[PDB]
Design an enzyme around this catalytic site. Structure first.
Site, short mmCIF file in Angstrom:
data_model
loop_
_atom_site.label_atom_id
_atom_site.label_comp_id
_atom_site.label_asym_id
_atom_site.label_seq_id
_atom_site.Cartn_x
_atom_site.Cartn_y
_atom_site.Cartn_z
N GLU A 1 0.81 -1.21 0.00
CA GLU A 1 0.00 0.00 0.00
C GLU A 1 0.85 1.27 0.00
OE1 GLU A 1 -3.13 -2.60 -0.08
OE2 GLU A 1 -3.16 -0.44 -0.43
N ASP B 1 -5.70 6.01 -6.14
CA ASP B 1 -5.01 4.73 -6.25
C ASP B 1 -4.92 4.30 -7.71
OD1 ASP B 1 -7.68 4.10 -6.70
OD2 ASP B 1 -7.58 2.20 -5.61
N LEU C 1 -9.05 3.24 2.41
CA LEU C 1 -10.04 3.70 1.43
C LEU C 1 -10.99 4.73 2.03
CD1 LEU C 1 -11.21 3.47 -1.43
CD2 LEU C 1 -12.64 1.59 -0.59
N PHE D 1 -7.90 -6.64 3.06
CA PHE D 1 -7.49 -5.25 3.21
C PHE D 1 -7.67 -4.49 1.90
CE2 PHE D 1 -5.33 -2.29 6.03
CZ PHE D 1 -4.86 -1.33 5.15
N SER E 1 -11.34 -21.10 -4.67
CA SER E 1 -9.96 -20.95 -4.23
C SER E 1 -9.84 -21.11 -2.71
CB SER E 1 -9.40 -19.59 -4.66
OG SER E 1 -9.43 -19.46 -6.07
#
Ligand SMILES: CCCc1cc(F)ccc1[C@H](O)c1ncc[nH]1
Ligand code: NA
Length: 567
Positions: free
Chosen positions: A12, A21, A33, A105, A118
Site C-alpha cells: 500500500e 489509487d 479507502l 485489506f 480458491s
C-alpha cells in the site's frame, strides 16, 4: 517482511496526502479507502470524521499508523464474522493468514468471500491449484504484481515474496540468453533464411497468382504455403535485431505477439497445407475427378477454413503477456521466457494438443499419401516398361514360344495401363472424351495384339513377328504421346517425398516434440535442461520456408520455368 503490518506497508505504501489509487479511488495513509466517488470533497468528508479533526487533505505520519492499525483489526474481525472466511482462516498458518488479510485489506470482506473455489483449495492445503485459480481473475488483471506476491505467499507459505523482488531466471536459461548460441548463431541462420526464403517464396507467390493459368487445387495450397512463409519472414529483420542485441525487445508487447503469432501460424499452416497438397496430388492419381474449376473453389474455401482455425487456435499466444524484463540481464525477452510461470500447466496441455492433432495426425495423412502416390506412379511405370520391353523381344525372338509369350505379357501390360491415369490428363475425369480417346488407343492396340496372337496360336511364327512392327506404329501414334514421361514423373514424386521428409525431420519433429518436453519440465521442476535444444529446434524450424521452394519445384510446372529462367 516480518508480519502482516510489514507486508501491507510494502503493498500500500505510505502517503500523508489524499491520492488516487491505481483504479482512481481516493485513499490516504497506508491503503485506507475513503470513498468510491469521483469527488475530491467527498473524500475530504470521510477523512475528517475518520481522524476526528479537519486534516484538510494532509495527515501526520503518526495518524497514518493509528488508522492503519485499526484497518487491520477490522479486516480480521470481518474474516471471523464471515461464515465463508472464518473456517479457511482457522486452517491457515500465520504466514498465509497475512496473505488472506492482505486480500481483505484490498478488496474488502465481501470481495474475498467471492473466491469460493480458491478458498476451498486453500482450506484443503492445495496451494498450487489455488494459486492457478487466483491467477485468472480481475484481481490479477488489475493488479498483477500485487496479486503475484500474495499468491506466492499462499503457494510457498513464506515471506519471500516481500523480501526478494524478481531479479533473474534460472541459471541455465540466463547463460543461454547471454550466450553466443542465441546472440550469434540464431541471427546468422535467421538472416540466411531471410535472404533465401523471402524472394524465393515472393516469386513463387507471384507465379501462382499472375503466371499460373491452370488454377488447380495444388497451386492454391502452394500459394498459401508461400503466403504463410512470407507472413513470417518479413518480420525477421526485427527478429534478427532482437537476438543480436542480446535477446532484448524494445518494439512493444503487441508487436512481439505479432511475431509470435505468425511464427506458430507458419509452423502449423505449413503442416496443414502440406497435408492438403500431398493428399490432393495423391488423390488425383488414385481417384481423379474432372471439375478443375469447382475443385479450385473448394480448395480456396478449405484454405480460408485453415487460416481462421489457426487464427483461433493461436489465440492463447496472441492474448497472453509474452514479454518480461529481467533485471539481472537488463534485457526484455520476447517469447523465450514465460512471464507467468503459473500458466505452464495451460501451456503444456496446449502444445500437447497441437503436437497430436496438428502434427502427428497430419503427418500420418501426409506420409501415407506418398505411399499411395508413389506406388501408383510406380505401377504405371512398370506397365509402360513391360509394354516396350516385350515389344522389343518379339523383334528379336526366333521360336514360336517367346513370341506368343511376349504378346500375352504385353497384352496384360496394356490392359493395366488402360485403367491407369495418364500423366497429362490429371484434372480430366475418367468419363471425359480425353480419357475415352486414351483408353480407345489401347483398344486399337489390344485388338492388334489379338491379331498377332491369332497368328501365334495358328503356328504362323514369322507372320506374327511382322505384326510387331505394326504394334510399334500404334505405340507411337496413340500411346507413347501419353506415357512418354511417366518415369520422369515418378522421379519427381520421390524427390518430393524426400523433400517433405527432411522438412519433418528438421523443422517439424524437433520443434513439436521439444515444445512438449520443454513445458513438461517447467511444469514438473520449474526448469528445463532442454532449453538449449528447444531454442535450436525453434530456429531450425524456420528452415521450412527455405525447403518450401523445392516443394513448388517438384509440383508446379510453371514454377520450374520461372526458376530455371532466373538462374
Ligand atoms: C522476438 C521473437 C522471439 C521468438 C518468437 C517465436 F514465436 C519463436 C522463436 C523466437 C526466437 O527467435 C527464438 N528462436 C529460437 C528460440 N527462440
Ligand atoms: Na512454410
Amino acid at each position: 517482511a516480518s508480519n502482516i503490518f510489514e507486508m501491507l506497508r510494502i503493498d500500500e505504501g505510505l502517503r500523508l496526502k489524499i491520492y488516487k489509487d491505481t483504479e482512481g479511488y481516493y485513499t490516504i495513509g497506508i491503503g485506507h479507502l475513503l470513498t468510491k466517488s469521483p469527488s475530491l470533497n467527498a473524500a475530504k468528508s470521510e477523512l475528517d470524521k475518520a481522524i476526528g479533526r479537519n486534516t484538510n487533505g494532509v495527515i501526520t505520519k503518526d495518524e497514518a499508523e493509528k488508522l492503519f492499525n485499526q484497518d487491520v483489526d477490522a479486516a480480521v474481525r470481518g474474516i471471523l464474522r464471515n461464515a465463508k472466511l472464518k473456517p479457511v482462516y482457522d486452517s491457515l498458518d500465520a504466514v498465509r493468514r497475512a496473505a488472506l488479510i492482505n486480500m481483505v485489506f484490498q478488496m474488502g470482506e465481501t470481495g474475498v468471500a467471492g473466491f469460493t473455489n480458491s478458498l476451498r483449495m486453500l482450506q484443503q492445503k492445495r496451494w498450487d491449484e489455488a494459486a492457478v485459480n487466483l491467477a485468472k481473475s480481475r484481481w490479477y488483471n488489475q493488479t498483477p504484481n500485487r496479486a503475484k506476491r500474495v499468491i506466492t505467499t499462499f503457494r510457498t507459505g513464506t515471506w519471500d515474496a516481500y523480501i526478494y523482488e524478481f531479479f533473474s531466471v534460472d541459471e541455465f536459461s540466463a547463460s543461454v540468453l547471454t550466450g553466443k548460441l542465441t546472440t550469434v548463431f540464431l541471427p546468422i541462420v535467421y538472416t540466411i533464411v531471410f535472404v533465401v526464403a523471402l524472394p524465393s517464396n515472393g516469386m513463387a507467390l507471384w507465379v501462382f497468382l499472375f503466371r499460373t493459368k491452370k488454377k488447380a487445387p495444388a497451386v492454391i495450397y502452394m500459394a498459401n504455403l508461400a503466403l504463410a512463409d512470407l507472413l513470417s519472414v518479413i518480420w525477421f529483420p526485427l527478429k534478427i535485431a532482437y537476438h543480436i542485441h542480446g535477446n532484448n525487445w524494445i518494439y512493444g508487447e503487441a508487436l512481439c505477439n505479432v511475431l509470435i503469432g505468425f511464427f506458430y501460424a507458419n509452423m502449423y499452416c505449413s503442416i496443414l497445407f502440406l497435408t492438403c497438397l500431398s493428399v490432393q496430388r495423391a488423390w488425383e492419381i488414385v481417384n481423379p475427378m474432372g471439375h478443375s474449376r469447382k475443385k479450385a473453389n473448394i480448395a480456396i474455401g478449405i484454405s480460408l477454413a485453415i487460416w481462421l482455425l489457426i487464427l483461433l487456435v493461436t489465440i492463447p499466444l496472441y492474448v497472453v503477456k509474452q514479454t518480461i524484463f529481467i533485471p539481472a540481464l537488463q534485457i526484455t525477452t520476447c517469447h523465450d521466457v514465460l512471464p507467468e510461470q503459473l500458466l505452464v500447466g495451460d501451456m503444456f496441455n496446449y502444445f500437447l494438443s497441437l503436437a497430436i492433432g496438428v502434427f502427428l495426425f497430419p503427418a500420418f495423412l501426409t506420409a501415407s499419401a506418398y505411399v499411395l502416390m508413389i506406388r501408383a506412379l510406380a505401377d504405371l511405370e512398370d506397365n509402360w516398361e513391360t509394354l516396350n520391353d516385350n515389344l522389343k523381344v518379339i523383334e528379336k525372338a526366333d521360336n514360336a514360344a517367346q513370341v506368343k509369350d511376349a504378346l500375352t505379357k504385353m497384352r496384360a501390360a496394356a490392359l493395366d495401363a488402360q485403367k491407369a491415369t495418364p500423366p497429362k490428363l490429371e484434372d480430366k475425369s475418367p468419363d471425359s472424351p480425353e480419357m475415352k480417346d486414351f483408353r480407345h488407343g489401347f483398344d486399337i492396340l489390344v485388338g492388334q495384339i489379338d491379331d498377332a496372337l491369332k497368328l501365334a496360336n495358328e503356328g504362323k511364327v514369322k507372320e506374327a513377328q511382322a505384326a510387331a512392327e505394326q504394334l510399334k506404329t500404334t505405340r507411337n501414334a496413340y500411346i507413347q504421346k501419353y506415357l512418354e514421361n511417366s518415369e520422369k514423373k515418378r522421379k519427381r514424386a520421390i524427390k518430393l517425398a524426400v523433400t517433405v521428409a527432411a522438412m519433418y525431420l528438421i523443422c517439424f519433429t524437433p520443434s513439436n516434440l521439444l515444445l512438449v518436453v520443454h513445458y513438461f519440465l517447467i511444469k514438473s521442476q520449474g526448469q528445463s535442461h532442454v532449453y538449449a535444444l528447444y531454442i535450436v529446434a525453434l530456429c531450425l524450424s524456420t528452415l521450412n520456408s527455405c525447403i518450401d521452394p523445392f516443394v513448388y519445384y517438384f509440383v508446379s510446372h510453371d514454377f520450374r520455368d520461372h526458376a530455371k529462367n532466373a538462374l
